[PDB]
Structure formats: structure tokens, C-alpha cells
């Protein structure tokens, strides 16, 4: 009913199930609740400015996920920033978001002004300080859960925003396995990482993470992939083009893989077809959606029949609870098959950009009493409700 409670509950029912694995380093669902309980208790002690979000700075280690959960457990949203982003990223966001604190899962490469910092050693000490924690004031409802920055703009995603997204991924559109084993390659500063983080966590699965050092080195990456017992794949189409440079990337060397999930770029017919050849018995999905409406809002299963019917791959069909439509420069409905701007309304739409009211007023509006978003995207929709992506209004 609350995603934090769902995840905490897996600590009680499957304490010893592995939840995270980085190149052979593993942690359990029990240690995840214990770490995030310990962090939350500690933040409760600091009397931090309430609502004010916390920046979480780091790469792809377990502590990243543990830290997120302790922050939302404390009542506040987390802002994830990746180690391999330039230093001014952390300076800009700190200046725009005015966070209550920065938690340095990885060492900060630069200072963050007056924002208090918890060092990696201090964080280590907190996680090793077990508490018996009442999670009585966790993030819930319309309150900010994460703020992911795209200038860069801080997309505020509430708890209920994320559940609209998560519920869709757990539905029969995708048929994800129970307790999935999922790849975690997109850095957590990126929206797409959510597509593997929270559907796996809601389902009690396990995250098999790749640090950037591995993806920076095709030798290492090609060597690493067969060692991961993953069922669910999440990445950009371009990253899959890299992995397909390996003839060995196929169902015989990766027998556990059953679901491929792509977002963030156009999936070319050549990429989907090479992959259909490599993994003929898997299910492949194209998805699309702006960060401002929580990860994705359309999907289409690229079946054999899809590959033969479509040259360019469509972006698919809307979530049941999300209303999508195509309008012209005046905000008026555009006929089926005519190009216009894609408008998105429903429960996953962000309440707006943090500390940027001018962008929020231009992009976000209300549609029949639902929050609605101007994507910058041109596309089409036929009468069957199938969407296609056709460029940007910019
Ligand atoms: N599967 C996809 N096919 C085509 N364009 C996409 C897809 N996924 C994301 N994009 C584009 O990426 C840009 C930013 O939106 P998004 O990355 O979906 O948040 C927009 O141009 C999107 O339409």
C-alpha cells in the first residue's frame, strides 16, 4: 500500500533473500531494511528543515539504494546524482534545489556550500548502528519521493506518482516474473534506472548492478554479462547495440533472460530484429515517456508480428490510467494520424519543477481535473490508440 512498507515487509518474510549484487558483493533484504532504518533514525535526529530534499551522490553500489530508502523513510525526497557526472552538476543542483543535506555514498569531488554532508565513512558508521525503527512518517501520498534532474530541471515525483508507474510495470502488459532478477545498468541519476529499481523491489527480486568501470571496458562488460542470472533487461536501445557487438550475447549464453525493456531513445527495427534473432523466446518491449510523467507511459511488445508489420517501431499504447492525446499549437485535438504535440494527463504526472515556477507554469496544466503535461514531443495516434514518435517541437 506504501512502497516503503512493501519493501520493509520483504525484510520480514524473506530476510535472507539477496536484494543486491555488484560483481559478487551481495546484500539481503534484511540488511536493506536495517541500513535504511538506521539512516532514517539518524536523519530524524538531525532535525533537518522538514520537506527539504536530500542529495544522494554516488555510483551503483548497494548503499545507493539503502540511502534512498532511509531518506524516503525519514519523510523527505532524495535527489540522486551520479559520480561520473561533471563537478558542476553537483554544484548546480545544490544551488537550485537548496537541499537539507548531501549524503556522499561516493566522496564528493567538490564542496556543496553550506549544505551539510555525511561522509562515506560516517554513512558506513550509521548503517552499522542498528535501530528498532517505527516507520511512522515515511514519504506517502502526494509528497515528493524522488526529484530527478533532467538547464537541468528538478522533476518532483511523489509517492503516488511512482505507484502509478510501478503498478503498470507489475501488470499483465509486461508479465514480469515474481522475484525477478534484473539488470541495473542505467545510473540512478537517470529516470530509466527506476524501471528496474522499483519493479524489482516491489516484486521481491534482486538487482544485478554494473558499475560504470565495467561498461567503460567492453572486455569487462562482455565478460560480466554471462555471469549475471538476470531475467529482466532494462536499458537504452543504444546500450543494447553495444552488447550486440558480442556474438556470444544470446539465449544460449544468457538462458535466464526473458524480458527486454527499452526506453529513452528510438528502438530501431535493426536493433529489435538482431535481438529477436539472439533471444527468439524472450519478450521485448519498446516504451516511452517523459521524466515529468514518471519513467514511461506507453509500451508495445515487439512481437514477430510487430516486426513484420512495422518498419519504424511505434512507441505503443498508453497505460490504462494515463490519458494521452495529440494536439495542435492551440491545444486542440488533432485528427488520428495527424502530427501534433503529445499531451499527458493522469496520476503519474509530476507536480512540477523544483524551485523553477516559470518552467512549471509553461509545461504543466490541468485537464478535466487531472494534472497534465506538455511533452516536447511530436507524434501520432491512430484510432486503435497506437502512438508513434515523430520528433520534437523544439
Ligand atoms: N521508445 C522511444 N522511441 C522514440 N523516442 C523515445 C523513446 N523513448 C524516449 N524517447 C524520446 O526521448 C526524449 C525524452 O523523453 P523520454 O526520454 O521518453 O523521457 C523524447 O524525444 C522522447 O520521445
Numbering used by the authors: 3 to 152, 158 to 401
What do the paper's sentences say?
TA d-alanylation is performed by the Dlt pathway, which starts in the cytoplasm and continues extracellularly after d-Ala transportation through the membrane. The first step in the d-alanylation mechanism of TA is the transfer of the phosphopantetheinyl moiety of coenzyme A (Ppant) to the DltC protein by the Phosphopantetheinyl transferase AcpS. The d-alanine-d-alanyl carrier protein ligase (DltA) catalyzes a two-step reaction: the activation of d-Ala using ATP to form a d-alanyl-AMP intermediate and then the transfer of d-Ala as a thiol ester to the Ppant group of DltC. Altogether, we conclude that DltC1 acts as an interaction hub for all the successive cytoplasmic steps of the TA d-alanylation pathway.
To investigate this mechanism, we produced and purified L. plantarum DltA and solved its crystal structure at 2.1 Å resolution. The asymmetric unit of the crystal contains two DltA molecules which are largely similar (rmsd of 0.5 Å on 392 residues). The last 100 aminoacids constituting the C-terminal minor domain are not visible in the electron density although present in the purified sample. The overall structure of the large N-terminal domain (residues 3–395) is composed of three subdomains (referred in previous studies as subdomains A, B and C39) two of which, A and B, sharing a similar topology with a β-sheet flanked on both sides by α -helices. As crystallization was achieved in the presence of d-Ala and ATP, one molecule of d-Ala-AMP could be observed in the electron density of one DltA molecule of the asymmetric unit. The d-Ala-AMP binding cleft of DltA is defined at the interface between loop 270–274, the β strands β13 (residues 290–295), β14 (residues 305–308) and β21 (residues 394–399) and the P-loop (phosphate binding loop or Walker A motif) comprised between residues 152 and 160. More precisely, the adenine ring is sandwiched between residues Gly271 and Glu272 on one side and Tyr295 on the other side. In our DltA structure, the P-loop is well defined in one molecule of the asymmetric unit. These new structural data suggest that the P-loop could therefore contribute to the stabilization of the substrate binding.
